[PDB]
Structures are given as structure tokens and as C-alpha cells.
Amino acid sequence: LSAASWRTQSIYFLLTDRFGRTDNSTTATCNTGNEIYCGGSWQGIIDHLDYIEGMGFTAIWISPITEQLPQDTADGEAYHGYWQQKIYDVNSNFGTADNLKSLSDALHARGMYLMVDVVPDHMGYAGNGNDVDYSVFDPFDSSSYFHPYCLITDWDNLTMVEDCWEGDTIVSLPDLDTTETAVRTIWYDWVADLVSNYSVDGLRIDSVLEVQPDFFPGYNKASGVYCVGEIDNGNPASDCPYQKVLDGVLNYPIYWQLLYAFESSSGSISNLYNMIKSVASDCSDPTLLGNFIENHDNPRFAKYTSDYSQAKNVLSYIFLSDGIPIVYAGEEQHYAGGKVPYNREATWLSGYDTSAELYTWIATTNAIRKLAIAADSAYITYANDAFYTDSNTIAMAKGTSGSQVITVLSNKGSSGSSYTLTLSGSGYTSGTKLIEAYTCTSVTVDSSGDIPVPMASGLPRVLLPASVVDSSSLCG
Ligand SMILES: [Ca+2]
Ligand SMILES: [Ca+2]
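That is the input. Now the predicted structure with calcium ion docked in place:
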């Protein structure tokens, strides 16, 4: 699928090793601090696709698929897929090639998409960079395709960042020399064939900051599908310019500010609003960014606050602002894991409870997003406008005039206190009929052009023309 078509998708990110077992167990032990394989497979995913599909996701993002280093170390095992050694083989722990193709077919058969995580930057090696045995790698069995060993010592130094090696002294990450024609060739063929053999619909690229930007255009082009890169940094000025060579980037700038605005009743709304404006100014298409509020590399949102109203609000935000929403398996179950590896809890230990508070919230949010898209073809590409803010509130408008969706967010918390807010600035006129989708409340705009918004227990509120909701069954 191309970038333009990816815009209307919703993705569930899971760690192949942590989501589901081929034996369907709900009880298989998984001590995270141990950093070993707990046993998830591509068949375990297939086996729980109903679970995923009931929250209304259209796509999944899975861990890398290549064969890894086989050892156990004080750094743990390669259960995450980021320590590869032989690229033309599969991670036999996850299953067989046939199994990977069956995942692809099972998804497509449901109207779902497959997104795969890929690592162009490095190889993995159980030993320090001085003693790497290049004979273990396929096809890169020569120290010649790699950059000279150095650790990344100074992160402000972008050359050093691109040319020295990720990792430490227990498990080193042999850094490929991606400027070399032979390594661009290997990699461009490799990604065209990956897509063609397993029918991938889109790619998630690891360590984009660690690769020179000119590598990316012929890699985007050889794969023939949307590419979203990981540039792990909070500065839009550093990660937006990559949108010049990739298509999309993961929305790390918004991540940090969303997290803090919502962790408490005193979190900063100003900070969020300013970051919206900065990204819209540096990024060529914010609607092509991957939005998230948790992932496998930072503490879980529930580790900072266990308030459910705060949790609902960051979820409405990822789905209803500009960009593609991405939920990290566990999120829907209110997983509380902190620092890595504490945040890599097995989903199966939740028992796949489809009646969890957040399971339901995401399913309703997904319905809403799908309704808006179905009703205004210019909705998804329309730029988001944060039109009102106060110390605990942000209201945003998106969609064609006469049709815009209005989203109202609050960081007051469960403590809340019911009141009505008179939202000015919507662009809707006097007497327009709206329906608040989460409560099914019908409201009429003021003679002055105000929307009286019923606020309670600091929960999100979303309004669409009554007309539209009346054409669905969000509201009976
Ligand atoms: Ca590099
Ligand atoms: Ca990474």
C-alpha cells in the first residue's frame, strides 16, 4: 500500500515473542527482567486475530523476521529481533517461512494489512566490537561492508551517530557501511523480495537516525510501499527533515509533550499546543506521521498515572489528531510496566479480556474515526486546528467546513466535576445540530455560534453533524 492510502489505517504494534502462543496458553511464565524468549510465534498471532480485530484495527506492526544471534548474555536474548545475523533466513523461534506467509494471508482475508519492522543499520554480535567473527553473517561475511569499530559517545555529533556502532561491549551491533554500492544493492534487492515474498503492505524502519539520509529514497522505492522511520528524538527540527527522504516518521516530538500534558491535572497544555504548531511548521505532512503514547522502548503511560480518564484522553488524541494511531499491545489492558525491559509484558497474561475498559474505548474511538473518514473524503488530509485551550483543556477541529469533527480533551482526571463548557471557535453556525459520540448527547449551537459541551470526570468529548451519526449506529 502507498503513503496516501495508509492515512486511513489504524495499527496495533506487538512484540512477536510477547503476544500469543501456538499452544494458546494464557498462563506461560514470562519474567521480563530476565530478558529471554517467552515463546510467542507467528501462529500465536493468527490464533488471536479476533481479539485484535474487535478493537477495530486494520493493520498490525510485528517485530523483525530475520534469524538472530543464538546466545544468552547479561544483555538478555534476541527476543526483540534487533540483533540479526543471516538475513535470507527466518527467526525459527517465531516459526517457519510458511507461517509468516500464512499470517499475511489470514490478515488479507480479513481486510487487514501487514506492517514489518526492518533493520538496515546493523548486524548483532555476542562479543565486543574488537573480536567480531564476520563468518557468522550472511551475506556480509567480510569486515569490508562494515564501518570501523567505535561506540557512539557524543550524540550531538551526527556523523559519529551515523558512523560509529550502537550497542555496548557484551552485545555489539556491527554497523554497516551504507554508503557502499554493494551494501545498497544487497539491501534494495533484499527489501523488494521481502515485500514480494510475504506480501507486506508497509514497513517500520528501525534506527533511521543512524543512517545517512541518501540511503532512504532508493530503499523506499525498491520496497514499493509506505515507510515510516524511527528517529528517536524529541526535536521536530531534527526529525521532520527526514520526511524529505521517507514518507513518514514516528511522532516522537508530540509523544513527550502529550505524555506530560496528561500525566496530571497540572500537566502543561501550552507545551502540547506549541509542539502541534512546531511540527506543522517543520513536517511536510503531519498526517503521514505515526502517533503513539507508549512503545517498547519507554515506560507505559499507566506507569506515570493510573487514572483511567487521563488514559482515555491520550488514546482519543492519537486517533483524532493528524497522523496514523498506533497502540502498543498491553495498552488496552492498562499494563503499568516502567523502564525497559519492565514495559515488555506478555499480552497473554491478561487472558485477552475483551471487556477491559480501554479495550472498549479503542473500539468506540476506531468506529468514530471510520465514520468521519467515510463522510468527508477531505477529512483525513485536512489539517487539524487547535482552536481553544485553557489550563486543563484543548479543543481541536478537523474536516471540511459544515462537516468538521470537534474533539475536546481535558487533563482534570477522574476527579473531574461536571460542568458545561461553551466552546467558541468551531466555525459551525447558529442552530447546527451535533451529537457528542461518546455519550450520544444531542446539542444545538448557540445564537452566538457557541457549542455547549457537557464535561464530566475529565473525559474526552467528540462532536460530529447529527446527520452523520444518524447514518451509523454509534448511537443506536
Ligand atoms: Ca550507521
Ligand atoms: Ca530503535
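Residues 121, 162, 175, 210-211 surround calcium ion (ligand 1) (CB under 6 Å).
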